[PDB]
Scaffold this active site. Sequence first.
Site, PDB file in Angstrom:
ATOM      1  N   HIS A 108       0.849  -1.052   0.013  1.00  0.00           N
ATOM      2  CA  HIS A 108      -0.020  -0.074   0.120  1.00  0.00           C
ATOM      3  C   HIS A 108       0.701   1.425   0.004  1.00  0.00           C
ATOM      4  O   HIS A 108       0.736   1.994  -0.635  1.00  0.00           O
ATOM      5  CB  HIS A 108      -0.753   0.053   1.179  1.00  0.00           C
ATOM      6  CG  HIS A 108      -2.133  -0.816   1.575  1.00  0.00           C
ATOM      7  ND1 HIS A 108      -1.624  -1.936   2.420  1.00  0.00           N
ATOM      8  CD2 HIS A 108      -3.159  -1.467   0.868  1.00  0.00           C
ATOM      9  CE1 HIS A 108      -2.736  -2.594   2.255  1.00  0.00           C
ATOM     10  NE2 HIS A 108      -3.547  -2.267   1.410  1.00  0.00           N
ATOM     11  N   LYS A 126     -18.132  -6.012   8.874  1.00  0.00           N
ATOM     12  CA  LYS A 126     -17.420  -6.573   8.110  1.00  0.00           C
ATOM     13  C   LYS A 126     -15.717  -6.964   9.064  1.00  0.00           C
ATOM     14  O   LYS A 126     -15.053  -7.797   8.626  1.00  0.00           O
ATOM     15  CB  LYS A 126     -16.846  -6.032   6.664  1.00  0.00           C
ATOM     16  CG  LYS A 126     -16.087  -6.844   5.853  1.00  0.00           C
ATOM     17  CD  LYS A 126     -16.301  -6.356   4.403  1.00  0.00           C
ATOM     18  CE  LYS A 126     -16.809  -5.079   4.074  1.00  0.00           C
ATOM     19  NZ  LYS A 126     -15.494  -4.083   3.749  1.00  0.00           N
ATOM     20  N   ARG A 129      -3.445  -6.883  -7.945  1.00  0.00           N
ATOM     21  CA  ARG A 129      -2.149  -7.705  -7.879  1.00  0.00           C
ATOM     22  C   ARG A 129      -2.347  -8.984  -8.617  1.00  0.00           C
ATOM     23  O   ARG A 129      -1.500  -9.655  -8.826  1.00  0.00           O
ATOM     24  CB  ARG A 129      -1.647  -7.778  -6.515  1.00  0.00           C
ATOM     25  CG  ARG A 129      -2.384  -7.643  -5.379  1.00  0.00           C
ATOM     26  CD  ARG A 129      -1.410  -8.007  -4.063  1.00  0.00           C
ATOM     27  NE  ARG A 129      -2.257  -8.759  -3.716  1.00  0.00           N
ATOM     28  CZ  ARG A 129      -2.210 -10.191  -3.732  1.00  0.00           C
ATOM     29  NH1 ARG A 129      -0.947 -10.770  -4.283  1.00  0.00           N
ATOM     30  NH2 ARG A 129      -3.269 -10.964  -3.577  1.00  0.00           N
TER      31      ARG A 129
HETATM   32  C1  LIG Z   1     -13.546  -2.648  -1.460  1.00  0.00           C
HETATM   33  C2  LIG Z   1     -13.404  -1.911  -0.020  1.00  0.00           C
HETATM   34  C3  LIG Z   1     -13.777  -2.856   1.170  1.00  0.00           C
HETATM   35  C4  LIG Z   1     -11.732  -1.609  -0.182  1.00  0.00           C
HETATM   36  O1  LIG Z   1     -10.888  -2.786  -0.630  1.00  0.00           O
HETATM   37  P1  LIG Z   1      -9.832  -3.780   0.157  1.00  0.00           P
HETATM   38  O2  LIG Z   1     -10.804  -4.409   1.061  1.00  0.00           O
HETATM   39  O3  LIG Z   1      -9.040  -4.486  -1.207  1.00  0.00           O
HETATM   40  O4  LIG Z   1      -8.722  -3.183   0.930  1.00  0.00           O
HETATM   41  P2  LIG Z   1      -7.067  -3.334   0.999  1.00  0.00           P
HETATM   42  O5  LIG Z   1      -6.669  -2.433   1.969  1.00  0.00           O
HETATM   43  O6  LIG Z   1      -6.347  -4.755   1.328  1.00  0.00           O
HETATM   44  O7  LIG Z   1      -6.371  -3.005  -0.314  1.00  0.00           O
HETATM   45  C5  LIG Z   1      -6.655  -1.755  -1.040  1.00  0.00           C
HETATM   46  C6  LIG Z   1      -6.220  -1.614  -2.538  1.00  0.00           C
HETATM   47  O8  LIG Z   1      -4.819  -1.702  -3.006  1.00  0.00           O
HETATM   48  C7  LIG Z   1      -4.351  -3.020  -3.320  1.00  0.00           C
HETATM   49  N1  LIG Z   1      -3.120  -3.654  -2.705  1.00  0.00           N
HETATM   50  C8  LIG Z   1      -3.132  -4.197  -1.713  1.00  0.00           C
HETATM   51  N2  LIG Z   1      -1.831  -4.863  -1.447  1.00  0.00           N
HETATM   52  C9  LIG Z   1      -1.281  -4.509  -2.438  1.00  0.00           C
HETATM   53  C10 LIG Z   1       0.215  -4.712  -3.225  1.00  0.00           C
HETATM   54  N3  LIG Z   1       1.068  -5.505  -2.375  1.00  0.00           N
HETATM   55  N4  LIG Z   1       0.481  -4.138  -4.083  1.00  0.00           N
HETATM   56  C11 LIG Z   1      -0.496  -3.514  -5.024  1.00  0.00           C
HETATM   57  N5  LIG Z   1      -1.694  -3.262  -4.407  1.00  0.00           N
HETATM   58  C12 LIG Z   1      -2.214  -3.856  -3.344  1.00  0.00           C
HETATM   59  C13 LIG Z   1      -5.607  -3.752  -3.358  1.00  0.00           C
HETATM   60  O9  LIG Z   1      -5.727  -4.951  -4.304  1.00  0.00           O
HETATM   61  C14 LIG Z   1      -6.721  -2.941  -3.466  1.00  0.00           C
HETATM   62  O10 LIG Z   1      -7.219  -2.425  -4.312  1.00  0.00           O
HETATM   63  C15 LIG Z   1     -13.846  -0.538  -0.174  1.00  0.00           C
HETATM   64  O11 LIG Z   1     -13.515   0.219  -1.217  1.00  0.00           O
HETATM   65  C16 LIG Z   1     -15.605  -0.359   0.036  1.00  0.00           C
HETATM   66  O12 LIG Z   1     -15.966  -1.161   0.893  1.00  0.00           O
HETATM   67  N6  LIG Z   1     -16.139   0.452  -0.561  1.00  0.00           N
HETATM   68  C17 LIG Z   1     -17.510   0.970   0.001  1.00  0.00           C
HETATM   69  C18 LIG Z   1     -18.530   0.091  -0.081  1.00  0.00           C
HETATM   70  C19 LIG Z   1     -19.282  -0.147  -1.672  1.00  0.00           C
HETATM   71  O13 LIG Z   1     -19.565   1.070  -2.228  1.00  0.00           O
HETATM   72  N7  LIG Z   1     -19.405  -1.283  -2.080  1.00  0.00           N
HETATM   73  C20 LIG Z   1     -19.883  -1.817  -3.155  1.00  0.00           C
HETATM   74  C21 LIG Z   1     -20.699  -0.777  -4.073  1.00  0.00           C
HETATM   75  S1  LIG Z   1     -19.561  -0.508  -5.569  1.00  0.00           S
HETATM   76 MG   LIG Z   2      -4.366  -5.948   0.548  1.00  0.00          MG
END
Ligand SMILES: CC(C)(COP(=O)(O)OP(=O)(O)OC[C@H]1O[C@@H](n2cnc3c(N)ncnc32)[C@H](O)[C@@H]1O)[C@@H](O)C(=O)NCCC(=O)NCCS
Ligand SMILES: [Mg+2]
Length: 163
Positions: free
Chosen positions: A19, A43, A92
């Site tokens: 991140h 969640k 990823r």
């Molecule tokens: C989808 C939600 C939960 C957030 O996503 P997530 O759970 O993946 O969070 P996470 O913090 O692990 O990752 C954040 C992002 O960076 C990316 N990421 C994580 N690790 C890495 C890495 N090593 N390298 C690159 N990218 C990465 C992920 O693939 C993701 O896109 C959030 O956006 C959400 O709930 N939105 C609101 C509700 C909504 O409107 N829902 C559906 C109607 S569209």
């Molecule tokens: Mg992640």
Amino acid sequence: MSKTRVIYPGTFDPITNGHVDLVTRASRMFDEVVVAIAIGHHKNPLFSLEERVALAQSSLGHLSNVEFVGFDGLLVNFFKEQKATAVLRGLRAVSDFEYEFQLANMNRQLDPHFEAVFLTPSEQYSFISSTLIREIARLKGDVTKFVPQAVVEAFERKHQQGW
Ligand SMILES: CC(C)(COP(=O)(O)OP(=O)(O)OC[C@H]1O[C@@H](n2cnc3c(N)ncnc32)[C@H](O)[C@@H]1O)[C@@H](O)C(=O)NCCC(=O)NCCS
Ligand SMILES: [Mg+2]
Ligand SMILES: [Cl-]
């Protein structure tokens, strides 16, 4: 020419080096970056909102164009409230790619101003995810190489209260 504002939404549970790399890359390309930490009310995150925000600030607060905010509700409502240019996501894996392709299209149908841009991780972060990191920490592995030091310490203080 106007000022650009991109949201980077996630649970950040916890924030990882992956991140961090993505936010740093994004902060070079847009005027403002908002690290947007989804509360996850129905969640069950391992770290509280306050812990996740503080870990993110500690890791990225040295970047002067990065803000940190918790949010809930529909991402498109947050997008509008924030007047964003776009949402940023990291891709990823193939499953990431197909989910995000679908979601960008759903969100564009809910709000035609919506936009989503994607970055690919550098190979040294490509295998890192928050879920995997939680699992290694829980089984008492060393996550030092994958996450900021503050996160390492945060796990030690869950392991100290017991976990
Ligand atoms: C989808 C939600 C939960 C957030 O996503 P997530 O759970 O993946 O969070 P996470 O913090 O692990 O990752 C954040 C992002 O960076 C990316 N990421 C994580 N690790 C890495 C890495 N090593 N390298 C690159 N990218 C990465 C992920 O693939 C993701 O896109 C959030 O956006 C959400 O709930 N939105 C609101 C509700 C909504 O409107 N829902 C559906 C109607 S569209
Ligand atoms: Mg992640
Ligand atoms: Cl997660």
